[PDB]
Amino acid sequence: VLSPADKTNVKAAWGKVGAHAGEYGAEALERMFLSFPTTKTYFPHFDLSHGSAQVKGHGKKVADALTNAVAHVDDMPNALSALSDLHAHKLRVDPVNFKLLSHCLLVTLAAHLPAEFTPAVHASLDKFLASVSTVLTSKYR
Amino acid sequence: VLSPADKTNVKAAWGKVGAHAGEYGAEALERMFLSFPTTKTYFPHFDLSHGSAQVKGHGKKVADALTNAVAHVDDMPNALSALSDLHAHKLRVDPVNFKLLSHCLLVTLAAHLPAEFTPAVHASLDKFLASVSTVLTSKYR
Amino acid sequence: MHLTPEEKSAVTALWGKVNVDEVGGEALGRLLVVYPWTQRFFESFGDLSTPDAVMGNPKVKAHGKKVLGAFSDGLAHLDNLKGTFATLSELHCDKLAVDPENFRLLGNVLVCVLAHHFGKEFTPPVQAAYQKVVAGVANALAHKYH
Amino acid sequence: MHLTPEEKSAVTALWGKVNVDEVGGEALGRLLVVYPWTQRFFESFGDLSTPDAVMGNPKVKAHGKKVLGAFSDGLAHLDNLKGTFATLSELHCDKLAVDPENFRLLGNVLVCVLAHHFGKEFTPPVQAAYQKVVAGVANALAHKYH
Ligand code: HEM
Ligand code: HEM
Ligand code: HEM
Ligand code: HEM
């Protein structure tokens, strides 16, 4: 569970992301495709080339969802219910892949928020992405 | 989340275990130590030799907690509070190891409860062990 | 493989007693039931709405036999699983887009099926040798992903 | 270790810019803070009660520098990690009893630290080379476990 401290940490770092969310969403995907090539198996229908609009479009959607989760940090299960359904029933992504993206998201934030990416915030952001992943995977079986 | 069917399946299977839980506990550990030798790093103070009294003893303890878990299938978090505490603050076993013990427990049940180890009971037991794992690692951070 | 002559013999000897037809159908079927998300690859098989519908589906049973078959042949090249599964690795990557994690889930299901079947015979030391083989196979199969 | 010549150059070029003293302390400190369970091996280190307590602990800083030191040496023998890390593998297992999963957590934290430090310079392609490297080191340190 996320503590008050964690909640403040996440609203704070995400706060800074602001308007670049979209772009950071795309970059996290690209990092993931390059470091964990097996994740590509879920986007056979995508142009995964550098600067692909499909990746850009997708990064934006992922970032919009995270932004939505932050806005409803006290009701994540409900705010993300629809996405939980989608992943469980249509996409059916193996649970292990959530940890891979999570990791690339952290690298992206670290690369862009030097001042805010403190040990304390790093810890809070990691617990956050793990909670997001848990919700997204809760209806798998 | 454990469905009513799941809870039923589990109570049944465990019902058949009966007075053998202790030996199954002990057998599950032995299988874990041989198959996943990295797990041994948490029992440096044990005699991990075959038929060791420490292992048998521990096997009973583990089996007992599962029993208690099955009995309070509806209130696991509360029934295992102390155990969640112990693991998170004292033992501090890495979360990946719970999956290895769970697996060795299924293999053990499978090997001893042929008739009862149907595909549907296998699915339920797996979910159950996963739930127990979640509970034991929920206070880690 | 990093199998001991003793470990090699153990694998080999239990395998000799396996009915691939039955173990294959059971392993693949259990997979689709325990880990429902693996069904994403078999929509064309029919109705997998229930354990019963999965365990009974002939398309499932036949895929299972095809899978254990290839597995079975790999046990004859235990000293070069890499080379044995190279083409199958490319195929699974490039044509099927199957996440290699599935290879590991199956492996575990396989071990449970063997225990199930051989009871007493499937001793701790015997499972240990099989755990090494299923992990080795999963690795060979995932080797050509890019 | 599928390090392409170009991936190896990239690993090497950036490592040239690292202050191992500093990075070592940050990576170790951050591990104890993000995954507190890892603190189990350091009860003789004193106060690890808070992030400042951890990040600032002279003992944490000194040990981090030691760990990264052995890691840097590893980077000079990318060809023979297993040989390079054999005595250390043995010690972590037999004397220290450190679960190898700890080596992977540290690898991921190190990658985050490198990103933190190099900003835009730690490009998608550079991250991918370091991912291969930390995995390779984690595997070499676990090779002697039994
Ligand atoms: C916290 C992590 C994740 C978040 C927030 C997330 C969120 C989303 C969202 C918002 C969409 C678009 C749904 C729509 O069409 O409205 C989506 C689709 C999708 N996601 Fe997830 N997802 C996450 C993890 C993953 C992972 C780890 C993978 C696989 C590696 C994945 C694979 C997919 C795929 C294949 C689609 C459909 C894309 C398309 O065809 O346009 N997701 N996700
Ligand atoms: C199915 C999940 C598990 C359950 C229900 C469980 C239950 C228990 C119980 C009942 C005890 C003894 C408490 C006491 O002494 O009063 C215990 C202790 C312990 N457990 Fe857990 N355990 C589980 C998973 C694990 C795993 C996966 C590991 C490591 C591989 C582990 C490592 C330990 C250790 C090292 C001890 C202390 C043994 C001693 O020194 O006596 N546990 N556990
Ligand atoms: C022990 C591991 C496995 C082995 C040895 C294996 C082997 C095979 C073989 C020999 C084929 C025949 C296709 C051809 O030659 O054209 C095949 C097809 C296929 N496999 Fe795998 N496989 C394994 C694991 C998996 C898993 C776990 C899945 C998904 C859960 C999977 C999904 C598929 C699919 C979707 C096909 C195509 C079937 C069709 O054409 O309808 N495989 N595999
Ligand atoms: C890149 C991975 C690692 C490398 C290269 C490394 C290297 C070293 C070295 C050179 C030593 C000193 C050897 C000696 O005392 O003779 C050491 C000791 C130690 N390492 Fe590792 N280490 C690594 C990861 C870890 C991790 C992740 C942990 C725990 C989370 C750990 C726990 C320890 C402990 C507890 C000691 C002994 C501390 C003491 O002196 O009391 N190591 N390590």
Chain A residue with minimum CA distance to B96: A96
Structure tokens at D26: 């940050």
In chain C, alpha helices (H): 5-15, 20-34, 51-56, 58-74, 81-94, 101-118, 124-142
Q: CATH number of the domain that C85 lies in?
A: 1.10.490.10
Q: Residue D128, CB half-sphere, CA atoms under 13 Å: how many?
A: 21
Ligand with an atom nearest the CA of residue D136: 4
Give dist(CA C127, CA B32) in Å, integer.
10
DSSP chain A: ---HHHHHHHHHHHHHHGGGHHHHHHHHHHHHHHH-GGGGGG-TTS--STT-HHHHHHHHHHHHHHHHHHHTTT-HHHHTHHHHHHIIIII---THHHHHHHHHHHHHHHHH-TTT--HHHHHHHHHHHHHHHHHHHTT--
> How far is the centre of ligand 1, averaged over its atoms, from the C-alpha of A139 (Å)?
15
Nearest chain B CA: its distance from C94 CA (Å): 30
Helix or strand or coil: residue C123? coil
Q: Is B44 on the interface with D (CB under 8 A)?
A: yes
Q: How far, in Å, CA of B136 to CA of A136, rounded?
A: 21
List Cβ<8 Å contacts ≥24 apart for D21-26.
D21/D65, D21/D68, D23/D68, D23/D110, D23/D113, D23/D114, D23/D117, D24/D61, D24/D64, D24/D65, D24/D66, D24/D67, D24/D68, D24/D69, D25/D55, D25/D60, D25/D61, D25/D64, D25/D65, D26/D55, D26/D64, D26/D113, D26/D116
Q: Report CA(B56)–ligand 2 centroid distance (Å).
A: 13
Of A35, A112, A117, the CB nearest to D128: A35
Q: Is C38 in contact with C105 (CB distance < 8 Å)?
A: yes
- Show residues of chain D in contact with A31, CB under 8 Å: 124, 127-128
Q: Does the C-beta of D106 come closer than 6 Å to ligand 4?
A: yes
Query: Which of B99, B97, B104 shows the shortest CA–CA distance to B131?
Result: B99
Chain B positions touching D41 (Cβ under 8 A) are: none
CATH number, position B78: 1.10.490.10
CB contacts, 8 Å: A111 with chain D:
115-116, 118-120, 122
- How far is the C-alpha of B77 from the C-alpha of B85, rounded, in Å? 11
C75 CA to centre of own chain = 12
* Ligand 1, atom 24, residue with closest C-alpha: A98
**Probe target for ligand 2 pocket from B41, B68, B86, B135, with the most ligand atoms within 8 Å of CB:** B86
Q: Do C146 and A96 touch (CB under 8 A)?
A: no
Three-state SS annotation for B66-92: HHHHHHCCCCHHHHCHHHHHHHHHHHC
Helix (H) or strand (E) holding B106: helix B96-112
In Å, how far are B108, C62, D19, D113, D136 from D104, measured between CA atoms? 30, 39, 22, 14, 10
Chain C positions touching B103 (Cβ under 8 A) are 108, 111
Mark yes or no for CB contact C131/B114 under 8 Å: no
Tokens of A129: 């992405």
Torsion on CA atoms C115, C121, C122, C126, rounded to nearest 10: -160
**Distance between CA B86 and CA A89 in Å, rounded?**
36
> Which numbered atom of ligand 3 lies nearest the CA of C110?
1
Residues of B in contact with A141 (CB under 8 A): 123, 127
| Closest chain D residue to the Cα of A112, Cα to Cα | D119
**Closest ligand to Cα A53:** 1
Pairwise CA distance, residues D22 & D116, whole Å? 13
- B40 near B128, Cβ under 8 Å? no
Residue nearest to atom 5 of ligand 1 (CA): A62
Q: Is D41 in the pocket of ligand 4 (CB under 6 A)?
A: yes
Rg (alpha carbons) of chain C, rounded to whole number: 15
| A87 annotated to a ligand binding site | yes
Backbone angles phi, psi at C80, to 5 degrees: -165, 65
Determine, for residues D37 and B94 on separate chains, whether the beta-carbon distance falls below 8 Å: yes
Of C103, D127, C140, D71, residue with least CA distance to A28: D127
Nearest CA to ligand 3 atom 1: C71
Contacts of B48 (CB under 8 A, 6+ apart): B33, B40, B55
- Residue A17's domain comprises 1-141
Is residue A35 within 8 angstroms of chain C, CB to CB? no
Annotated binding-site residue? B87: yes
* Ligand 3, atom 31: closest residue by C-alpha: C98
Domain with D100 in it: 1-146
**Ligand of minimum distance to the alpha carbon of B36:** 2
Domain count, chain D: 1
B123 close contact with A: CB closer than 8 A: yes
How many structural domains does chain B have?
1
By Cβ distance, the residue of B38, B44, B140 closest to D145 is: B38
